[PDB]
Amino acid sequence: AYTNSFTRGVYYPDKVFRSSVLHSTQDLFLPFFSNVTWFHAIKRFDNPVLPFNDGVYFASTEKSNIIRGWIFGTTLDSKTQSLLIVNNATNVVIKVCEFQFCNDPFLGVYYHKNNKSWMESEFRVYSSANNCTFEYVSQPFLMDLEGKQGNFKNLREFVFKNIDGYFKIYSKHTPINLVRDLPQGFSALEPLVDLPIGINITRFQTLLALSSSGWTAGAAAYYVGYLQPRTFLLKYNENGTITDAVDCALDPLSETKCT
Amino acid sequence: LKSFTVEKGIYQTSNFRVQPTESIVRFPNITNLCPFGEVFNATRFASVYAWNRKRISNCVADYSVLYNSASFSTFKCYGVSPTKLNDLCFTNVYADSFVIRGDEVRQIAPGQTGKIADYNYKLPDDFTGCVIAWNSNNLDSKVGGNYNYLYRLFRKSNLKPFERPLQSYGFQPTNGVGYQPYRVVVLSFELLHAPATVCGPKKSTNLVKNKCVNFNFNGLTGTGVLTESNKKFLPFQQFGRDIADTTDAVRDPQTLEILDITPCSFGGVSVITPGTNTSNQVAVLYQGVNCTEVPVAYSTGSNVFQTRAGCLIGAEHVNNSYECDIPIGAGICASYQTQTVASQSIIAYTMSLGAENSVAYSNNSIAIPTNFTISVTTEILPVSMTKTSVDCT
Amino acid sequence: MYICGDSTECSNLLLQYGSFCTQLNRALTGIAVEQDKNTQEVFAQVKQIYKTPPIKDFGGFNFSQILPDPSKPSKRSFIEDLLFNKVTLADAGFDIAARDLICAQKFNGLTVLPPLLTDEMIAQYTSALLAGTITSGWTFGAGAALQIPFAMQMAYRFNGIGVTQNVLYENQKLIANQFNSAIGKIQDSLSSTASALGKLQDVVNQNAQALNTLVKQLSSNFGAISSVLNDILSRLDPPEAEVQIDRLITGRLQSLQTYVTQQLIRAAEIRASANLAATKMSECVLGQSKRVDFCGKGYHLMSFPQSAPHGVVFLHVTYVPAQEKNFTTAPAICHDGKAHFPREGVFVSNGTHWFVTQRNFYEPQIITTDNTFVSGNCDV
Amino acid sequence: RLDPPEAEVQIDRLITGRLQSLQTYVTQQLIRAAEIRASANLAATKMSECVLGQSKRVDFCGKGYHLMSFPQSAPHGVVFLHVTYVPAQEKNFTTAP
Amino acid sequence: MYICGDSTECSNLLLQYGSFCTQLNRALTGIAVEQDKNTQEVFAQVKQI
Ligand SMILES: *[C@@H]1O[C@H](CO)[C@@H](O[C@@H]2O[C@H](CO)[C@@H](O[C@@H]3O[C@H](CO[C@H]4O[C@H](CO)[C@@H](O)[C@H](O)[C@@H]4O)[C@@H](O)[C@H](O[C@H]4O[C@H](CO)[C@@H](O)[C@H](O)[C@@H]4O)[C@@H]3O)[C@H](O)[C@H]2NC(C)=O)[C@H](O)[C@H]1NC(C)=O
Ligand SMILES: *[C@@H]1O[C@H](CO)[C@@H](O[C@@H]2O[C@H](CO)[C@@H](O[C@@H]3O[C@H](CO[C@H]4O[C@H](CO)[C@@H](O)[C@H](O)[C@@H]4O)[C@@H](O)[C@H](O)[C@@H]3O)[C@H](O)[C@H]2NC(C)=O)[C@H](O)[C@H]1NC(C)=O
Ligand SMILES: *[C@@H]1O[C@H](CO)[C@@H](O[C@@H]2O[C@H](CO)[C@@H](O[C@@H]3O[C@H](CO[C@H]4O[C@H](CO)[C@@H](O)[C@H](O)[C@@H]4O)[C@@H](O)[C@H](O)[C@@H]3O)[C@H](O)[C@H]2NC(C)=O)[C@H](O)[C@H]1NC(C)=O
Ligand SMILES: *[C@@H]1O[C@H](CO)[C@@H](O[C@@H]2O[C@H](CO)[C@@H](O[C@@H]3O[C@H](CO)[C@@H](O)[C@H](O)[C@@H]3O)[C@H](O)[C@H]2NC(C)=O)[C@H](O)[C@H]1NC(C)=O
Ligand SMILES: *[C@@H]1O[C@H](CO)[C@@H](O[C@@H]2O[C@H](CO)[C@@H](O[C@@H]3O[C@H](CO)[C@@H](O)[C@H](O)[C@@H]3O)[C@H](O)[C@H]2NC(C)=O)[C@H](O)[C@H]1NC(C)=O
Ligand SMILES: *[C@@H]1O[C@H](CO)[C@@H](O[C@@H]2O[C@H](CO)[C@@H](O[C@@H]3O[C@H](CO)[C@@H](O)[C@H](O)[C@@H]3O)[C@H](O)[C@H]2NC(C)=O)[C@H](O)[C@H]1NC(C)=O
Ligand SMILES: *[C@@H]1O[C@H](CO[C@@H]2O[C@@H](C)[C@@H](O)[C@@H](O)[C@@H]2O)[C@@H](O[C@@H]2O[C@H](CO)[C@@H](O)[C@H](O)[C@H]2NC(C)=O)[C@H](O)[C@H]1NC(C)=O
Ligand SMILES: *[C@@H]1O[C@H](CO)[C@@H](O[C@@H]2O[C@H](CO)[C@@H](O)[C@H](O)[C@H]2NC(C)=O)[C@H](O)[C@H]1NC(C)=O
Ligand SMILES: *[C@@H]1O[C@H](CO)[C@@H](O[C@@H]2O[C@H](CO)[C@@H](O)[C@H](O)[C@H]2NC(C)=O)[C@H](O)[C@H]1NC(C)=O
Ligand SMILES: *[C@@H]1O[C@H](CO)[C@@H](O[C@@H]2O[C@H](CO)[C@@H](O)[C@H](O)[C@H]2NC(C)=O)[C@H](O)[C@H]1NC(C)=O
Ligand SMILES: *[C@@H]1O[C@H](CO)[C@@H](O[C@@H]2O[C@H](CO)[C@@H](O)[C@H](O)[C@H]2NC(C)=O)[C@H](O)[C@H]1NC(C)=O
Ligand SMILES: *[C@@H]1O[C@H](CO)[C@@H](O[C@@H]2O[C@H](CO)[C@@H](O)[C@H](O)[C@H]2NC(C)=O)[C@H](O)[C@H]1NC(C)=O
Ligand SMILES: *[C@@H]1O[C@H](CO)[C@@H](O)[C@H](O)[C@H]1NC(C)=O
Ligand SMILES: *[C@@H]1O[C@H](CO)[C@@H](O)[C@H](O)[C@H]1NC(C)=O
Ligand SMILES: *[C@@H]1O[C@H](CO)[C@@H](O)[C@H](O)[C@H]1NC(C)=O
């Protein structure tokens, strides 16, 4: 579905503190009110190799880390070094190696559906680490992955960028109130991790962890917006938190505001 | 003024700026240390023709503990120097560790004769990688002789340089110089493959406050006065900029605290003098500076009068009120007058707008002049200035 | 300092150009001296500091909202305080600074010199002018101040605009009420609206923006590898770093020259405005002006100055005719073959009878030999 | 000292510097000329209104009540001798409207 | 447009010179507005035809 973001995709373009300043930056951003593809995190396995056109905005309304991690590279066949950001319920294992990628690298656990148990049909997410150049595992933390349906409060908005060989990940855990399509609001994304990997990324792919007769499709979806070189006018409050932004090319009124 | 006589007035002179007292450098802690210790203290290396290669990257390749150690016999850098090693950043460093007979150490030199050289590990003429060789006779010498390091590298098939003489009887503790086993490690590194991620350790100095110093925070260099700040940076923010996009706050990398930055005090210096012929006495004004700092750059003083326009030196302060003579600013004027008698000196005062007057206005009172005076006054106005034609060419 | 902040090599390179810095400093110093001279010329126009008597028996007129208020620490009037509050700075303290100038521009060799006359002194000058006016008419502008009751002063002004003083002496209470109401309306308008002081606000904003742009220009490469002198020096050897430093020096010198030229032109404009303000003070406050539309719209009666940040405010009091009646007029009158013309006034008729009246206020009177002078005969 | 192929750099540097100096001088002269023109217009008005006639404008032709003025040429300027009437001795009386 | 008329490379090079173009545009716009102000002040002196 061709969903449209409203004011999401705003992240701190740098590490500078500004108070009560209307700074204007010319950096990669998600254009306001832009068509963002809507997928079905489910026989029908939605998991393609979507293009990575100089940045990607990833958002989702999943819980317990349904979408584990991501794959980056240009060949994605172990012929060229490829990043593997495969996350689990404990910690991320960010790893750049010429890892061999299976055609269907997804855990496939039919957990708590009929048998009321956690069973692992196969473990083909990993195929082989034939050749590697760098790896980094973070601390074994524990995110709020515990099963709590209630009302979704995990809008794990993400932004991935690759400039001058540096891989940047901006993220922010913004709780929401409506389980329906992306909500209305404003929330800047703080930087999370930076890496001097330096490889060339042309495509990217998502990873999932979840026979065809009467299969109850999983209820989860993730959006994939695209960044684009644009000029924004960011408002910093007294505490130096971006409270509002203006897309200086959205419409004549916004252009005047920026001017 | 390029003159030997100066007229009454106040003249600007060389600007005054407080110089930095000391240089302060702050950097994050050096924690990610490369596996140099394990690479150089391995129990045993592979064969000379099967030298083991270990990639060293994403760390600090400190050499202080390396060079200073006296346990080494030979260590030469043919492309770099230990002095500049710390101040150089490497993209990636590879360590090739192997054990060879003492004689082969000569062959290890780049561009040296001996087919063994290019059979096992050839060194190209442009190899800048540092090489470390240290005697390990006891470690690598067996009682009966270590024959694993066979030296039959005369294979019929030719092995070209970087394609990818059985004079040793047995390594014994009695082996003389040149024949004992030697532990050789090569510090081969490359560039133009990835963003730089290997750099030498960076020193750190102590922190000082309320003193004009030359700071350097994570490569952010500048001069100013560091002061404890009440600002609240976010965890990921380092610097603090102003409306004019000028740095004004900083976060100390070691201790996560926010320090304000204030430019070192500075301002113009003005000399207040009456006519040269009248006298040679003068008084100086340090514009926009309090003279708790003036003596840094008449140092003794004996007359300091803090005014809103800067501290005044050499002028007596009197709370009479006269017509302004030499303007100073913020409602202060200077003049040359006697009285205490004699000792004609320069005085400072708050200028007087004029004699107070109170008209005797009343409901039914009028004052009518009974006499007049004819007054003639002169007014001057420029009308033109000298013509001037210039031949540009 | 601006071009080569703390860089001996950059200073040595700047020595090549040499006297440009001296030229710029001379121009800016001239501008500052001009500013002080402008304020002096506009305000310092009284040889003595007159002060109003304690008893404010001004014939029913009420000046409480323009005379000084001793209660406040700064002896400013109600309206002067209103103006000072309305005009607000943009960048930071110019001022009320109890410390360093405390501005962003201070980081780069930019300093703001305080004005020679403090706001308290400007207010004192304004108070002197106002008290001298209300207590002695226009006489204090020509010589020693001579007292005169305010009602009589207003009668003189009315005579000046061509209305007989009996009009004022008979409508004194109404005129006083109207004047007080007008003053109150002015106070309310200033208190409520915010675009009244557009000119002063624009001056302040222009200066702040000019300084801000000047400081912002320090972050431009101007074709060099980087905009940080220390960065260039540490990253390049001197023989080539001299080229980059020269590029930066050229760029920053051009920025300074542009700023100084803009300041010179703006100072010319401000000097023109200050000369106009001084002329208005001299001709409307110190006296009564016959020039049309100069001191306000309508027939001028008087004016009162009020000091505002970086400017002055005049409260022009003017006389405006209100209600008109249609009449029939004749240039002259024939009595006995002689043509009688009005001495001062005009002949009017309400429809059946003829009268002679002053031209600016309907006060009919019998046509007698005192109001008219004979000249010639009828037929001409 | 240098040959034609290599003297253009030096000549260009000198040309740039001297042209900048000339432009600065000309702009300064233009601004000064505008100021002098304002002053000269004021002087012409003062002549027309104080010498050729009697002025009622206060403090225009000198302090006090203006009577007459006399012009006197000066180098690159003019000098006016404003003759004015000034009340001197005031005796205060009771008055009624 | 005047300096780098229809040239992305020239525009990118010019962007390194700061706010010179913005200052020039502001100056010319100020002059243009002041012209209308002059005509208004001179002629529109009576609000009744
Ligand atoms: C233009 O203006 C003139 C003057 O106002 C008008 O002419 C009239 O003149 C008289 C005064 O002379 C005005 O008031 C009247 O006074 C009378 C006494 O004065 C003598 O003259 C009038 C006529 O002028 C004679 O009629 C009169 O007999 C006298 O010999 C009064 O007698 C009049 O009537 C009553 O007046 C008062 C009340 O106000 C009573 O107490 C009296 O007892 C008397 O009964 C009158 O008062 C008169 O107003 C004028 N008329 C007008 C219309 O104004 C012109 O007429 C006027 N033209 C126009 C078109 O208005
Ligand atoms: C001349 O014009 C002035 C402005 O109109 C007049 O000042 C007004 O005078 C009246 C009373 O005479 C005030 O009404 C009072 O307001 C106070 C407000 O608290 C304080 O401020 C007033 C200001 O005058 C002061 O009078 C009070 O005593 C207090 O100190 C109320 O508390 C009272 O109850 C009463 O309402 C007006 O506030 C005051 N200003 C205005 C805008 O009206 C002045 O009286 C005139 N002088 C004359 C006619 O001689
Ligand atoms: C010339 O212009 C003057 C100002 O416009 C006029 O003075 C006004 O004349 C009226 C009538 O005499 C006065 O009103 C009188 O006094 C009070 C005022 O309060 C009332 O005000 C208006 C009328 O003005 C009324 O509609 C309100 O409801 C109030 O009740 C009241 O007791 C009466 O209205 C009474 O008529 C005005 O006060 C007065 N204004 C001023 C500032 O003095 C004058 O009449 C005009 N004509 C002439 C020949 O002078
Ligand atoms: C971020 O911006 C806000 C608004 O400018 C700053 O105001 C502070 O916000 C906090 C709310 O958490 C206030 O604390 C609260 O105070 C009330 C009243 O005392 C108390 O009842 C609550 O329990 C809570 O403690 C705080 O008073 C208020 N002012 C200050 C000086 O903190 C806020 O400071 C900024 N936060 C930063 C820079 O971290
Ligand atoms: C293998 O391990 C031994 C220690 O058991 C090393 O002996 C070292 O010899 C050098 C002097 O030649 C000294 O190094 C020292 O390092 C430590 C920090 O690790 C510190 O005391 C000084 O910085 C000093 O430089 C010291 O005598 C000793 N080092 C230690 C830790 O005991 C031997 O050098 C190692 N051989 C390798 C890595 O090839
Ligand atoms: C670089 O190394 C230091 C060393 O840990 C890191 O911070 C340090 O944390 C210790 C915690 O014990 C601080 O010691 C403190 O001593 C005071 C003495 O009164 C005591 O009251 C505290 O409870 C604490 O024990 C130590 O002062 C502190 N030093 C610094 C420079 O922060 C530091 O975070 C590391 N910085 C980086 C960029 O890695
Ligand atoms: C002003 O004159 C008085 C004396 O003259 C009287 O007041 C004038 C205002 C005017 O109305 C004259 O016609 C009066 O005859 C001077 O001082 C006065 O002295 C007398 C005698 O002691 C006394 O009755 C008054 O109260 C005094 N009034 C004042 C104001 O002093 C006064 O010196 C003259 N000059 C000034 C500036 O007031
Ligand atoms: C996700 O990452 C965690 C923690 O790193 C994994 O737990 C260990 O991870 C390291 C490195 O991947 C392995 O060497 C260990 O064998 C792991 N041990 C165990 C008991 O898991 C964890 O396995 C990963 N996956 C999940 C679902 O937690
Ligand atoms: C992949 O395996 C090969 C060794 O079989 C190595 O790749 C070398 O990496 C270095 C550094 O980039 C290059 O200089 C060599 O040219 C590479 N050789 C070959 C044959 O590719 C390394 O062990 C692994 N590198 C990666 C990216 O996986
Ligand atoms: C992906 O990017 C890399 C470089 O980022 C390309 O490899 C070469 O990199 C050097 C320096 O960056 C360039 O000078 C070469 O021109 C690059 N090679 C080519 C053919 O352009 C690499 O080519 C890019 N494409 C892929 C599939 O990796
Ligand atoms: C100004 O008058 C004051 C009188 O107070 C003098 O200033 C101080 O006055 C008190 C005593 O009354 C003492 O602090 C000193 O006698 C004075 N201190 C200083 C620094 O002057 C002062 O003598 C007079 N002259 C000035 C201020 O210039
Ligand atoms: C120069 O040094 C003196 C030292 O006292 C400063 O005096 C301070 O003035 C401010 C303004 O009111 C006060 O807040 C301080 O308490 C005063 N004492 C100190 C120690 O600062 C003076 O202000 C300084 N001049 C400046 C900053 O311009
Ligand atoms: C964006 O989405 C809306 C509706 O989803 C659609 O009408 C519009 O054509 C889309 N824009 C583009 C460029 O596809
Ligand atoms: C439940 O267990 C059976 C095997 O006993 C398996 O065939 C089936 O796929 C499982 N279903 C789910 C939802 O786990
Ligand atoms: C001013 O200087 C001249 C030359 O020295 C001297 O003749 C004259 O007396 C001086 N006037 C003074 C000190 O008043």
Swiss-Prot record, chain A:
Impact upon substituting R156S:
In strain: Gamma/P.1
Disulfide partners: C97-C132, C248-C258
Residues of the region (Putative superantigen) are: 237-258
Q: What is the effect of changing N200Q?
A: Increased resistance to neutralizing antibodies
Q: Name the source's superkingdom.
A: Viruses
Q: What is the effect of changing K113E?
A: In strain: Omicron/BA.2.75
- Annotated region described as Disordered, given as residue ranges: 108-130, 139-151
Q: What is the effect of changing R68I?
A: In strain: A23.1
The record lists the effect of T61I as:
In strain: Iota/B.1.526, Mu/B.1.621, B.1.1.318, Omicron/BA.1
Q: What does this protein do?
A: Attaches the virion to the cell membrane by interacting with host receptor, initiating the infection. The major receptor is host ACE2. When S2/S2' has been cleaved, binding to the receptor triggers direct fusion at the cell membrane. When S2/S2' has not been cleaved, binding to the receptor results in internalization of the virus by endocytosis using host TFRC and GRM2 and leading to fusion of the virion membrane with the host endosomal membrane. Alternatively, may use NRP1/NRP2 and integrin as entry receptors.
Q: What is this protein called?
A: Spike protein S1
Identify the gene encoding this protein.
Answer: S
The shown chain, on whole-protein numbering, covers 27 to 302 of 1273
